[PDB]
Amino acid sequence: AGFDRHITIFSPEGRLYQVEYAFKAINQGGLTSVAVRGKDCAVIVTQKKVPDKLLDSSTVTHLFKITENIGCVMTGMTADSRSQVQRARYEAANWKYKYGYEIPVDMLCKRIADISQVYTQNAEMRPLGCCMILIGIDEEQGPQVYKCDPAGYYCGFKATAAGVKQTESTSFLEKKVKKKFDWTFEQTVETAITCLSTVLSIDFKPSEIEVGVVTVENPKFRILTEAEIDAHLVALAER
Amino acid sequence: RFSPYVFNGGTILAIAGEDFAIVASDTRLSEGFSIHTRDSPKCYKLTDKTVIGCSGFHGDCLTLTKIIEARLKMYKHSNNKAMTTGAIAAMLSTILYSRRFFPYYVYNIIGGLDEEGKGAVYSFDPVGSYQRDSFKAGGSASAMLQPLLDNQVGFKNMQNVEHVPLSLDRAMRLVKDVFISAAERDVYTGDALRICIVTKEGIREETVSLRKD
Amino acid sequence: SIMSYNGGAVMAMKGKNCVAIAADRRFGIQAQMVTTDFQKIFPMGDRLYIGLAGLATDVQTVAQRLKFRLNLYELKEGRQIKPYTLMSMVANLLYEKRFGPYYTEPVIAGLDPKTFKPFICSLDLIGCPMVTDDFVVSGTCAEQMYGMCESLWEPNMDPDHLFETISQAMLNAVDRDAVSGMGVIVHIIEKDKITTRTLKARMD
Amino acid sequence: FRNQYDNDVTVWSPQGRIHQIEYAMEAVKQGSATVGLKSKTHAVLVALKRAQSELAAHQKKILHVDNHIGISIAGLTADARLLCNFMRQECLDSRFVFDRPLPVSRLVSLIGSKTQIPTQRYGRRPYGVGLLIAGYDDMGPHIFQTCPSANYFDCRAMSIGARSQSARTYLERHMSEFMECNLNELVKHGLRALRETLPAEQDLTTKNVSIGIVGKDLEFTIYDDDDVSPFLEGLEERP
Amino acid sequence: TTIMAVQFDGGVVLGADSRTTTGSYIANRVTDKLTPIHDRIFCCRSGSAADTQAVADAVTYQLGFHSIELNEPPLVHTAASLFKEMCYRYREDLMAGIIIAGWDPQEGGQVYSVPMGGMMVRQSFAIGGSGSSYIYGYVDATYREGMTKEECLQFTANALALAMERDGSSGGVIRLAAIAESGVERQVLLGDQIPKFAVATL
Amino acid sequence: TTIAGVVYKDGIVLGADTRATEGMVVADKNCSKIHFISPNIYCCGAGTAADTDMTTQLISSNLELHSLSTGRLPRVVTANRMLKQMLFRYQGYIGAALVLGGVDVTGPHLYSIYPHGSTDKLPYVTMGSGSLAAMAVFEDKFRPDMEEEEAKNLVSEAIAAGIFNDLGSGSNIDLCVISKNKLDFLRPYTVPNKKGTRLGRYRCEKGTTAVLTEKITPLEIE
Amino acid sequence: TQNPMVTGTSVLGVKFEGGVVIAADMLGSYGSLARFRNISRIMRVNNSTMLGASGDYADFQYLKQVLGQMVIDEELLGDGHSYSPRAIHSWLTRAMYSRRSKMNPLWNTMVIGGYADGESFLGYVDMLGVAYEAPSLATGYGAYLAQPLLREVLEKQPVLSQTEARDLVERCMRVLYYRDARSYNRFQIATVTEKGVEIEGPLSTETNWDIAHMI
Amino acid sequence: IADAKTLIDKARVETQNHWFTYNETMTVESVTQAVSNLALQFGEEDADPGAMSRPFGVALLFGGVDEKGPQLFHMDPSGT
Amino acid sequence: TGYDLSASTFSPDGRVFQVEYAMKAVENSSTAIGIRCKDGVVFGVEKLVLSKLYEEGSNKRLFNVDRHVGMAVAGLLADARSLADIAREEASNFRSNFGYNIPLKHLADRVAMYVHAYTLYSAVRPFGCSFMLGSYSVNDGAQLYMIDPSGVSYGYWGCAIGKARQAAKTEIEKLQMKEMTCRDIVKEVAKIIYIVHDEVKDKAFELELSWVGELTNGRHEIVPKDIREEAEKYAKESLK
Numbered sequence A: 001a002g003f004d005r006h007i008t009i010f011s012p013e014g015r016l017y018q019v020e021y022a023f024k025a026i027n028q029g030g031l032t033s034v035a036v037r038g039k040d041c042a043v044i045v046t047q048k049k050v051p052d053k054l055l056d057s058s059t060v061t062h063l064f065k066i067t068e069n070i071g072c073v074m075t076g077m078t079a080d081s082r083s084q085v086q087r088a089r090y091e092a093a094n095w096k097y098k099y100g101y102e103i104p105v106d107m108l109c110k111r112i113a114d115i116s117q118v119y120t121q122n123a124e125m126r127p128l129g130c131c132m133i134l135i136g137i138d139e140e141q142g143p144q145v146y147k148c149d150p151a152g153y154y155c156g157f158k159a160t161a162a163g164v165k166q167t168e169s170t171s172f173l174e175k176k177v178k179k180k181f182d183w184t185f186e187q188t189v190e191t192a193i194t195c196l197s198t199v200l201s202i203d204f205k206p207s208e209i210e211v212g213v214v215t216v217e218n219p220k221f222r223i224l225t226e227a228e229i230d231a232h233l234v235a236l237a238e239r
Numbered sequence B: 001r002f003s004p005y006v007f008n009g010g011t012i013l014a015i016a017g018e019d020f021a022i023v024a025s026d027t028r029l030s031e032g033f034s035i036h037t038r039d040s041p042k043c044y045k046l047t048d049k050t051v052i053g054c055s056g057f058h059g060d061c062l063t064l065t066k067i068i069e070a071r072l073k074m075y076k077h078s079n080n081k082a083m084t085t086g087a088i089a090a091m092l093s094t095i096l097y098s099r100r101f102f103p104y105y106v107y108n109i110i111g112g113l114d115e116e117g118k119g120a121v122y123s124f125d126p127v128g129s130y131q132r133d134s135f136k137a138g139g140s141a142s143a144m145l146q147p148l149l150d151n152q153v154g155f156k157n158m159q160n161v162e163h164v165p166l167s168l169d170r171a172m173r174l175v176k177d178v179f180i181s182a183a184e185r186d187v188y189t190g191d192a193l194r195i196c197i198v199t200k201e202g203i204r205e206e207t208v209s210l211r212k213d
Numbered sequence C: 001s002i003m004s005y006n007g008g009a010v011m012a013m014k015g016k017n018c019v020a021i022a023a024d025r026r027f028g029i030q031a032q033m034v035t036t037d038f039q040k041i042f043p044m045g046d047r048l049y050i051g052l053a054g055l056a057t058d059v060q061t062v063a064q065r066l067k068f069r070l071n072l073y074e075l076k077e078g079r080q081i082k083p084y085t086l087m088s089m090v091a092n093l094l095y096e097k098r099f100g101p102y103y104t105e106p107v108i109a110g111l112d113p114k115t116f117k118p119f120i121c122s123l124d125l126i127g128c129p130m131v132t133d134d135f136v137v138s139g140t141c142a143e144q145m146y147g148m149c150e151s152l153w154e155p156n157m158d159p160d161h162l163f164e165t166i167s168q169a170m171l172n173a174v175d176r177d178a179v180s181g182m183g184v185i186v187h188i189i190e191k192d193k194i195t196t197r198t199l200k201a202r203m204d
Numbered sequence D: 001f002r003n004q005y006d007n008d009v010t011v012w013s014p015q016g017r018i019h020q021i022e023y024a025m026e027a028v029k030q031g032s033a034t035v036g037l038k039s040k041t042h043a044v045l046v047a048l049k050r051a052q053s054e055l056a057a058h059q060k061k062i063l064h065v066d067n068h069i070g071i072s073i074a075g076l077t078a079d080a081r082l083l084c085n086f087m088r089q090e091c092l093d094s095r096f097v098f099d100r101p102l103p104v105s106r107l108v109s110l111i112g113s114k115t116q117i118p119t120q121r122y123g124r125r126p127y128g129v130g131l132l133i134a135g136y137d138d139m140g141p142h143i144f145q146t147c148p149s150a151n152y153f154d155c156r157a158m159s160i161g162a163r164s165q166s167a168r169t170y171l172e173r174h175m176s177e178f179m180e181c182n183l184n185e186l187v188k189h190g191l192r193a194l195r196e197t198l199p200a201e202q203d204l205t206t207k208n209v210s211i212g213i214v215g216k217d218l219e220f221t222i223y224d225d226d227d228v229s230p231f232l233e234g235l236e237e238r239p
Numbered sequence E: 001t002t003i004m005a006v007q008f009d010g011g012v013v014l015g016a017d018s019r020t021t022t023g024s025y026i027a028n029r030v031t032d033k034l035t036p037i038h039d040r041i042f043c044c045r046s047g048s049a050a051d052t053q054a055v056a057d058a059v060t061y062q063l064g065f066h067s068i069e070l071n072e073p074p075l076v077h078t079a080a081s082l083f084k085e086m087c088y089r090y091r092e093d094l095m096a097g098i099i100i101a102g103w104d105p106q107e108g109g110q111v112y113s114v115p116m117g118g119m120m121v122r123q124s125f126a127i128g129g130s131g132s133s134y135i136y137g138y139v140d141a142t143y144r145e146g147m148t149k150e151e152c153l154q155f156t157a158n159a160l161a162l163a164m165e166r167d168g169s170s171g172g173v174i175r176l177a178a179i180a181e182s183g184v185e186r187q188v189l190l191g192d193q194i195p196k197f198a199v200a201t202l
Numbered sequence F: 001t002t003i004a005g006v007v008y009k010d011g012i013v014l015g016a017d018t019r020a021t022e023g024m025v026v027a028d029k030n031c032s033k034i035h036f037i038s039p040n041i042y043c044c045g046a047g048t049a050a051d052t053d054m055t056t057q058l059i060s061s062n063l064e065l066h067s068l069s070t071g072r073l074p075r076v077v078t079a080n081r082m083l084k085q086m087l088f089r090y091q092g093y094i095g096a097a098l099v100l101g102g103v104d105v106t107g108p109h110l111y112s113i114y115p116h117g118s119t120d121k122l123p124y125v126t127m128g129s130g131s132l133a134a135m136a137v138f139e140d141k142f143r144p145d146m147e148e149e150e151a152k153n154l155v156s157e158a159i160a161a162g163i164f165n166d167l168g169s170g171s172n173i174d175l176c177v178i179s180k181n182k183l184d185f186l187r188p189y190t191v192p193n194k195k196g197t198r199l200g201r202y203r204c205e206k207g208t209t210a211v212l213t214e215k216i217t218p219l220e221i222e
Numbered sequence G: 001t002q003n004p005m006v007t008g009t010s011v012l013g014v015k016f017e018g019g020v021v022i023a024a025d026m027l028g029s030y031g032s033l034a035r036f037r038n039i040s041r042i043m044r045v046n047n048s049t050m051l052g053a054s055g056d057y058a059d060f061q062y063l064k065q066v067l068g069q070m071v072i073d074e075e076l077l078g079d080g081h082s083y084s085p086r087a088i089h090s091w092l093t094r095a096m097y098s099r100r101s102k103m104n105p106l107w108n109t110m111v112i113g114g115y116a117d118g119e120s121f122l123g124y125v126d127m128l129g130v131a132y133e134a135p136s137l138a139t140g141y142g143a144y145l146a147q148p149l150l151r152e153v154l155e156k157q158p159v160l161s162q163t164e165a166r167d168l169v170e171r172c173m174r175v176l177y178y179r180d181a182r183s184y185n186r187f188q189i190a191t192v193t194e195k196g197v198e199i200e201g202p203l204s205t206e207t208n209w210d211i212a213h214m215i
Numbered sequence H: 001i002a003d004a005k006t007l008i009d010k011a012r013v014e015t016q017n018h019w020f021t022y023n024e025t026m027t028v029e030s031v032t033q034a035v036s037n038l039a040l041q042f043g044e045e046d047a048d049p050g051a052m053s054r055p056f057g058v059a060l061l062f063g064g065v066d067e068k069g070p071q072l073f074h075m076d077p078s079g080t
Numbered sequence I: 001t002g003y004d005l006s007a008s009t010f011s012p013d014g015r016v017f018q019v020e021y022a023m024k025a026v027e028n029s030s031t032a033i034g035i036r037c038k039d040g041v042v043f044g045v046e047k048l049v050l051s052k053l054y055e056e057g058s059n060k061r062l063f064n065v066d067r068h069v070g071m072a073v074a075g076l077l078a079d080a081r082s083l084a085d086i087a088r089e090e091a092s093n094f095r096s097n098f099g100y101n102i103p104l105k106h107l108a109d110r111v112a113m114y115v116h117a118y119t120l121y122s123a124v125r126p127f128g129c130s131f132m133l134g135s136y137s138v139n140d141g142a143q144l145y146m147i148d149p150s151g152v153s154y155g156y157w158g159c160a161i162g163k164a165r166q167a168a169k170t171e172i173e174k175l176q177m178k179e180m181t182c183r184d185i186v187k188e189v190a191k192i193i194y195i196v197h198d199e200v201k202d203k204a205f206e207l208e209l210s211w212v213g214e215l216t217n218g219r220h221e222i223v224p225k226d227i228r229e230e231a232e233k234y235a236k237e238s239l240k
Helices: A017-028 A078-099 A105-121 A166-178 A185-200 A226-238 B058-079 B085-098 B142-152 B168-185 C056-077 C083-096 C142-152 C159-175 D019-030 D077-098 D104-120 D164-173 D183-197 D229-233 E049-070 E076-089 E132-142 E149-166 F049-070 F076-090 F131-141 F148-165 G057-077 G085-101 G146-156 G162-179 H002-022 H028-043 I017-028 I077-098 I104-120 I165-173 I182-196 I225-239
Strands: A032-037 A041-047 A063-067 A070-076 A130-138 A142-148 A159-163 A209-215 B011-016 B021-026 B029-031 B034-037 B043-047 B050-056 B106-113 B119-124 B130-132 B135-139 B192-198 B203-209 C009-014 C018-024 C027-029 C032-035 C041-043 C048-054 C104-111 C118-123 C129-132 C135-139 C184-190 C193-199 D034-038 D042-048 D062-064 D069-075 D129-136 D141-146 D152-154 D157-160 D209-215 D221-223 E003-008 E011-017 E020-022 E025-028 E034-036 E041-047 E096-104 E108-114 E125-128 E174-180 E184-189 F003-008 F011-017 F019-022 F025-029 F034-036 F041-047 F096-103 F108-113 F119-121 F124-127 F173-179 F183-190 F211-218 G011-016 G019-025 G042-046 G049-056 G109-116 G119-125 G131-133 G136-138 G187-193 G197-199 H060-066 H069-075 I032-036 I040-048 I062-064 I069-075 I129-137 I141-147 I153-155 I158-161 I205-213
Touching (some): A017 A070, A017 A130, A017 A159, A041 A070, A041 A130, A041 A142, A063 A078, A070 A078, A070 A209, A078 I104, A105 A142, A105 F049, A130 A159, A130 A209, A159 A166, A166 A185, A185 A209, A209 A226, B021 B106, B021 B168, B043 B106, B043 B192, B058 G085, B058 G131, B058 H028, B085 B106, B085 B119, B106 B135, B106 B192, B135 B142, B168 B192, B168 B203, C009 C104, C009 C118, C009 C142, C009 C159, C018 C041, C018 C104, C018 C118, C048 C056, C048 C083, C056 C083, C104 C184, C129 F025, C159 C184, C159 C193, D019 D129, D034 D069, D034 D141, D034 D183, D042 D069, D042 D129, D062 D221, D069 D077, D077 D104, D077 H028, D104 D129, D104 D152, D157 D183, E003 E041, E003 E096, E003 E132, E003 E149, E011 E096, E011 E108, E034 E049, E041 E049, E041 E076, E041 E174, E049 E096, E049 F076, E076 E096, E076 G057, E132 E149, E149 E174, F003 F041, F003 F108, F011 F108, F034 F049, F041 F049, F049 F076, F096 F173, F108 F124, F124 F131, G011 G119, G019 G042, G019 G049, G019 G119, G042 G187, G057 G085, G057 I077, G085 G109, G085 G119, G119 G136, H002 H028, H002 H060, H028 H060, H028 H069, I017 I129, I032 I069, I032 I129, I032 I165, I040 I069, I040 I129, I069 I077, I077 I104, I104 I141, I129 I158, I141 I158
Antiparallel strands (some): A032 A159, B029 B034, B043 B050, B119 B130, C009 C135, C027 C032, C118 C129, C193 F211, D034 D157, D209 D221, E011 E174, E020 E025, E034 E041, E096 E108, F003 F011, F019 F025, F034 F041, F041 F096, F108 F119, G011 G019, G042 G049, G109 G119, G187 G197, I062 I069, I129 I141
């Protein structure tokens, strides 16, 4: 072989194996993230696992705010994830400075994704092993969810997942979208929690999940407080 | 608007001798009509056998002394010997020319003992032309001091007078007197005279007091 | 002015299915004529011509440079430049030196490669394009020529009439300017043929 | 096999060790021994020079960085000449800028930083000279050693070079006496310690010993072939 | 232009005239020189409009990026320091005087003045621009410590009015803003609302 | 050059004169000073003519790449910022003074950009040599919430005031009306003044001009 | 700063036995307008050194920032070494000269005052970079007015006591308020002693206006 | 022979540079140190592109009469 | 298998081994512990004395990165000194541009990003040092942050790095540090440092203790020798 081992070399069947190897890294983290888009809200939920009691819970987060109205959940290597978040925050501000309006979510995914292709085509660097899902509200098109993967693909999805149980998570979400009932904010959050819980079989407690929401009524990305998460979790159990 | 130079004044004198070299200078730094300090000797000891005297913009003199001092150390490390007076003179010539386009306003005199053991005085123009000269006066009072040294040390325009090699004593007497005269007629020179005598034993510094304005 | 140092006059006029470009022929340093045969109109195509007046050095350089760009364009695109495109390419060349400008004011006159519609346009030192349906003039004697042209020009002129109007206008105009003159060359471009005639003018 | 992991400074070994840096450290052992000791008032460097042939002169093992600092090289001479120049220029710079002799400790930090850059980046080999730096600054006499690895240590006494364990052993036993020692005693103690490194047949001679002394009143001076005679004469005979 | 900020306990009242002039022609009679650098940090801009508008936007960009990364409301002193560096580094090329005022939870209402040349001085009340010269006396006499926010709004209005009448460059409506923990309340005073002081009427 | 713009209830009307003057001679009439930045943004320019043409063109191009990528019609603010930053970097050496008008999702926006990079969002703006004369008409008659026809009249009257009052301006008046729904580029909105009839025919008959030499080269039409 | 903008005038210092005292007005004047009246033109570089400045406040503020970090860096190093008053003076001389060479002068003229190792140091650094050390230093119009009073006391008595020195600076500050337009009544006095640098807050000068009625 | 030609050239320029700067004749030792410094650069010590990567393959014996009298210094590809 | 040779490479299973290999380097170094209590953060390092010849109070593994923040390092010392320099430069820049003492959380992030960069490129090896930074500011509070060779940065109420990290964490875990005051913690840190040290494998250790907090007026400083001595006594007595 030797077809793998450099991003630039293409396999005899044209597969650029190193990029594929990176997608494997996201799973190595062992955490899954689910995002679902409602009629008026977009929610990102991720599993928060704190390895040691000593670690401060507040510091460990996979949910970051790219700009006041765009929020992202990054799954993969933790260090790579932080690096991409900074680039996103820089890119988001650079758009406001140059063009005078807040970057549309689609354009942030496009810029971030395009940066990833450069890594995929240039020899020295390694594709960052992280996947970022961005949630934002665009006035013209309502709520938006976009995912950029280490390859540079930037598709936008009604609902999506990243991590160890992504395939299972996608199936659960697919069944729920096919039986479309539209989603109110509560349902959008409930669907997300049920999906993560069912795929992981966790039966989550408020501490284990971090949930972030963007709504048309309050466009700013907010990370829900543990109490707010508990309220939704309690309702799910009650019904 | 900003003028990069000011005349900080001062006068420097150097007298060579068969075995001794004397470099002497005022101690007053004056900007404009004001006297910045009355104790700023303008003579610096580069090495045991050499003293540099600088007059002009003080800021240039401080930088040049620092540069020459550094380069002397670098010559010592690289060549494992002290720079001779002749070498310091040539190096200074090159250093000064480096800024021919934005010049150092310093009139410099290097006085010291040569390798043969005789005393040598090297005088430099602000842009670095260097001449080995038996006696030279530089600075605000070069005009006043140089003629006297030429009559007394060089026996010029004197008929039927014998030529006697200068002695450290006669020269110290002469240096003290010429500076006394300049203090009286040059506003810039005054306060005190530091006379540095370089002989095989080494630099010896003697200070005499000229009139405070 | 720097423009007045070498001196020049160029004019172009639009008739019906014909264009005429005419220019003076004197090359002089300030006041001394050196040559009476300077070329200020250069062919940039089968039926497109450019006229440069201004510092002679610039006239020669901008023409030589434009040809480099044009020849490559023709080889690369395998097509003759449409007249409006040369104007744009020239404007880019001139604007590139917006600071330190080439001191030439060009006039471009031609027939469209396929339609054969006439095109006359002029550009300033910094490269500002002006397309006019009547006449365009550039040079030291511009004021004199503008007046002669405004009165004499009539719309839909036939080729023989166009030659007579351009010749009368250039001849009378260069007469009232000291630094331009010593002969005028009129090139007439019609779809079928190009006729270049040198007029008889006061050599003073 | 494990031939792999040893080719470059940029490859970490499976057990956390960068082998090339270690291989570089081995270079100091190849060089002739040098011993440095300190007293409350003076710092001394003594070296055992080696000669290519009887006709050839002994190499210079002690070099003067500045009036207050001097170094003794053990290892590749080339790396030493290069490092010494950097050190000399850094010292000259301090006098021009701040008109103060550079604190000896600060210089060693700078030598460490310059030395580390080769270790992390592909390209230049790690410097393979081991340096003993001795100086008197306002804080006091100081003796520091620098490894080919950039790590530097402050020492009461140290010997770097071939068969230097023997010297370190003598120095440790007689160490307490050194602090209150007179200069003659301190150089004498050092000459004995380097004697241990020498093969039993070989003896200290005026030709192979170089002594460098820096102190509150003494500018660094390298006493050489005929000027080591005062310090050597007082010494006894091999134990 | 006359720009004036005064710090009341718990916040700042910034005020400015609306006139921008090219020569003796008033190009814009309703310009807003009080701009929001951040949610609770605003700057009054006096000096060349081009330079002020550029520096203001660049600081908005820098403060915003910093706030998102530090995940905290930005400090008014930080904004001032960013303005100070730009104005100092490009002092030769920039002709701008900016008064930066804002509320940060850490230090409360703060008014900082960057005069042309790049100095940052915290001041209890800061006046800037061409019209400021005429009102230096009114402010010195009128300023009393511990004025209420409403008292400050009147103080800023009267001061800006006095300058507007005596400076040709100053003029137009008075724009006044009160920035506090609660939020920014922006008010425009026009015509009769602008305070009027009686003329000599000999 | 009188260039002027107004915000009507649902859009912007931009007006400009059609005369380009080199020194004190009218180099050209029918010059076009309302440039196209984008389908929804049109900008009128005054000042060094070349600078206005090139700057508008570069921004028109950049905005096209931006709109194509974003997939949405360009916003007026983007046009202003791109224009201002470019102008600021050049420090007034590029002497382009522009009135930028457009309707975007936010609504109708009109901006005036001075050569040094200053910008003003204003209900009515006039720039150029005749700006002072035009401003007078606007100050006197601008009313908020004007209907489109009234606005076209105000902008026409103002450019007209400049044409008659200022020496530099003069020729036909051009109005461009941008509305959320549509753009009408009304070149020759009005021809205020026309050249008088040439009473005498001075046409030269053939043979009037002597020719020393002639060469006829036949182009091969094919 | 090719053109000075907000500037301050006269910082005076004299070396008492056991330390140096430097004093400064607290006014930054925008060309004849006393725009800034509580600015402090004296800084504590380190326990052993203090610097005061006359000239563009902006350039001083930059120098404080650069010099302060240089001091902070030495402290973090924690080698027990520290910058002497002389060293800070040498650096400033090289720095001001460098900017003069680049024809981008720092307008400030500064006094570096410090007591280390039992020796007091007072030094002058000009915008063109002229530097010297001397017993008493006055920058600004002070050189023309205050320095003559200070030098006379010093020539007659070379060594002065802290009380004597503070009194002299108060007297010299009084003259400067009386005969220099750019001066302001409020001044700060700071003294480097073996103990450290302490800067007194606004201190004001009693003024005799008796000659007015004499007319 | 070829790498020698470069080293002999650095030496010739350095002796001349010393005359220009210091109006004196370089000692044999300094001249060897000067050529040696070039030889040491083979290690990629400097970032300059124009430095041979390979160690020089020449050994030079430099002999001259200086202030210390007749002296012969030997230089090796290492640069010692 | 060539997957582990470079950090640019990714193993077929998704793991970048060179970074993991770098993390093993820290385990080679001696243990260092940092505990955050209400008043401030106390850091302790067991500094093995390799030779009697080396001077005491030298070869420090605790560095002051700025007036208010202190860094304790474990791992290849050379890299650590270099990382400390990067940190000090970053702190200076934040003060120079933003005009105030760097918030520690930001400092950790900036240094981490620098550390992460080395992870991506193939020219440079991952840094081999794991370090802890701590600061106390009245507004911010007491903050302890630890950066792995990977560039992961997290805030730890209590943290340990080095050979005995696992053992130390168990001891640190039974401390109820949040309630405890700074002076008491210094004794506790010492007890843990003594417990983890293995006398048989490591001949001898000198405990180096540093602290930042209200007591130090927010300046990271080496613990005064009187306090250190008292703690070392408390530790030996507890070891029994």
